[PDB]
């Protein structure tokens with residue numbers, strides 16, 4: 001029993017992290033087979049970042065402009081190319097620790113584990129949700145670009161995030177491993193901002209189920225509601241609309257608890273309106289929205 | 302920027318996790334060099350757990366009564382011994398993935414990463430603090446006994462916790478890797494219960510310093526406090542006493558931020574009195590006490606915002 005935010009074990013990813021240096025810029029790369037993946041802004045100087053022409057900046061670079069360090073071992077770069085906002089450096093040595101892996105783009109609302117790294121060296125692990133506004137609430141300092149996010153399914157690492165930048169509110173933005181940004185962000189030092197954060201309704205509901213399953217039952221009531229009335233409340237509180245697909249995904253937990261989703265929604269309605277009346281749910285004084293239904297089922301049944 | 306409960310990268314510990322079976326009971330063990338460490342209650346039936354005599358249960362066991370599996374490789378046990386509440390199984394193979402490591406016993410307030418495991422297979426990693434009542438607030442299903450807690454400051458893995466039991470309130474108890482329980486708990490199905498818990502004051506202060514480092518000052522005030530007056534107030538909120546050792550330990554964060562320790566204590570006294578008036582601190586609506594001063598320095602910029 002118990003309920004905690006928990007990351008996937010990071011060992012399979014630790015063994016892929018390397019240090020990539022281009023000129024004066026050093027950040028992290030991901031070494032899979034004989035290719036190292038990293039943010040393309042590694043090729044940029046400060047003045048470049050102000051308005052980069054990445055095509056031209058890359059054309060004027062050669063293999064010899066890149067230094068890749070796997071621990072103490074230097075990896076010789078023998079090719080380079082760009083895919084979207086990711087730089088691909090072909091190296092002379094296949095990573096003998098390459099896990100079984102896929103590149104997958106994740107959907108907003110879903111979670112993944114971040115291995116925060118500095119200078120090619122793993123420093124910590126934590127779980128993040130891809131938020132509706134396509135940012136993540138990470139913990140990153142300078143030198144962390146190229147840190148990756150991932151999920152593990154059996155033996156297969158699904159890489160879904162590479163870290164590129166910090167936004168003014170302190171939240172974080174990046175790309176998938178094919179170099180496509182999550183959200184309307186660009187890899188240039190220009191005015192950029194997180195849009196309005198909206199709350200992930202299905203995850204809040206999931207977490208209330210987790211609370212019930214862990215003996216926190218005080219928010220429950222005899223009442224139920226409809227999708228339409230609830231969604232009018234959700235809109236007022238900058239919650240995402242709840243869909244029938246969401247209701248269906250929560251089905252296991254409705255059954256497990258005997259609390260139907262729209263019954264739980266009446267609970268959530270009061271909490272949004274009347275508040276939490278001084279209590280806590282699962283040790284929080286806020287409504288938590290970064291636990292998916294899956295995340296919750298893994299620990300509550 | 303940002304501030305998160307951040308675990309250590311778990312790989313060095315993942316390579317040490319094995320599956321230990323005795324009888325019908327399976328749980329996790331820790332394979333370091335040629336020894337596997339696991340809870341001695343693996344030799345107990347459920348009937349044995351009310352009043353087991355571990356000496357008498359163990360003398361009846363042969364090496365071949367212990368099945369140790371590392372992935373799909375069966376390890377051969379060639380000896381055994383009990384050290385307090387931990388069973389040490391000598392195996393015929395030294396673990397080639399053994400990291401540099403040490404065993405440490407921690408004090409209440411200290412944090413560590415837990416690699417939750419089942420049937421020898423790692424499932425997740427998360428941070429825990431040793432609570433003042435010698436329990437941890439973990440997430441463990443049945444089969445998770447033998448999961449370990451650790452830190453990896455610098456180059457070696459410091460193992461500080463092995464999981465043994467769940468208490469009635471849903472919190473967790475275990476031992477150091479020399480098999481000595483934290484707290485008064487025993488590997489026996491007794492009516493035993495966690496003591497009343499209290500808030501780790503020095504960690505709350507460290508976290509308030511983290512909030513200042515990350516650019517937030519709204520909770521400061523114009524007041525100061527003596528250490529004694531601070532403790533007289535804090536104890537009324539079930540906060541642990543703050544000691545001169547704690548004040549000394551917070552010196553580096555005080556120097557980085559320019560906020561005297563006892564001035565930050567005055568801020569905490571006011572936060573306890575007022576609440577947050579709808580604000581959050583580092584994303585939380587309550588005062589967080591599972592980040593140590595060392596945790597904050599580990600994670601935060603060395604330059605205050």
Ligand SMILES: [Cl-]
Nearest residue numbers: 284285286586
């Ligand atoms: Cl909270």
Ligand SMILES: [Cl-]
Nearest residue numbers: 406407408411
């Ligand atoms: Cl300690």
